[PDB]
C-alpha cells in the first residue's frame, strides 16, 4: 500500500527537482526528498571558550560560528538517528521539535 501522501518527498508540481549527494555516503538524492539539517557550531567548543578567552588577544573578539547545511539520504539519516522511525499517526506530524 501507500505509506505517505507526500510519497516520501516534497514534490507536487515538478516531475524532476535535482539530485544532491548524501554527506555520509554520497548517495544521489532528489533535493526535496533529502533530509536537511543545519549544523551551527561554535568555531571552538562549548568548553574551550574560557581557554581561548584567556590565551588570546582581542578580548572576547568574535567567537565565530561554523555554518553548514547537511544533506542526508533516508538510510543514513535513519542509521544516524536523525529522523527516528515513527508510528502511523505520529509520522503525519510535520513539526520540528
Partner 1 sequence: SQVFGVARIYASFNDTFVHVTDLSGKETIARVTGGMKVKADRDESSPYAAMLAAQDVAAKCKEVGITAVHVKIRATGGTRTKTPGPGGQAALRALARSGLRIGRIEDVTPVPSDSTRKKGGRRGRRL
Partner 2 sequence: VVDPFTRKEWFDIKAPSTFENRNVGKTLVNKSTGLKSASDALKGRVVEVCLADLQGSEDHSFRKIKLRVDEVQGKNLLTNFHGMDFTTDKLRSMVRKWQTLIEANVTVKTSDDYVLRIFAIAFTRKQANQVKRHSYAQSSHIRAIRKVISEILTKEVQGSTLAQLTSKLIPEVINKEIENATKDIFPLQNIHVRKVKLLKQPKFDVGALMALHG
Partner RNA sequence: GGUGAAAUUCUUGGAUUUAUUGAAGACUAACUACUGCGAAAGCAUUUGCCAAGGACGUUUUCAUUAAUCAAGAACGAAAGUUAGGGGAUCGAAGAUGAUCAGAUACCGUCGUAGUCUUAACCAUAAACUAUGCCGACUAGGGAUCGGGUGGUGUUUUUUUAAUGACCCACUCGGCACCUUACGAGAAAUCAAAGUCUUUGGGUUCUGGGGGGAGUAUGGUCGCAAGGCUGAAACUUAAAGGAAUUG
Site residues (vs partner 2, CB under 8 A): 43, 58, 61-62, 64-68
Q: Which does 25 bind (CB under 5 to 8 A by kind): partner 1, partner 2, Mg ion, none?
A: partner 1
Distances in Å between the Cα of 50 and the Cα atoms of 44, 62, 63, 69 are 10, 13, 11, 28
Q: Could you tell me which residues are beta bridge partners of residue 42? A: 65
Q: Which of partner 1, RNA, partner 2, none does residue 16 bind (CB under 5 to 8 Å by kind)? A: RNA
CB 65 within 8 A of CB 44: no
Beta bridge partners of 66: 41
Residues engaged in binding partner 1 (CB under 8 A): 21-23, 25-28, 39, 43-45, 48, 51-52, 54-58, 61-62, 64, 66, 68, 73
Amino acid at each position: 500500500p501507500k505509506k505517505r501522501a507526500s510519497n516520501g518527498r516534497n514534490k507536487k508540481g515538478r516531475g524532476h527537482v535535482k539530485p544532491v549527494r548524501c554527506v555520509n555516503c554520497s548517495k544521489s538524492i532528489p533535493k526535496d526528498k533529502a533530509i536537511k539539517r543545519m549544523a551551527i557550531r561554535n568555531i571552538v567548543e562549548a568548553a574551550a571558550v574560557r581557554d581561548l578567552s584567556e590565551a588570546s588577544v582581542y578580548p572576547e573578539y568574535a567567537l565565530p560560528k561554523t555554518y553548514n547545511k547537511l544533506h542526508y539520504c533516508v538510510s543514513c539519516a535513519i542509521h544516524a538517528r536523525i529522523v527516528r522511525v515513527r508510528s502511523r499517526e505520529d509520522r503525519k506530524n510535520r513539526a520540528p521539535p
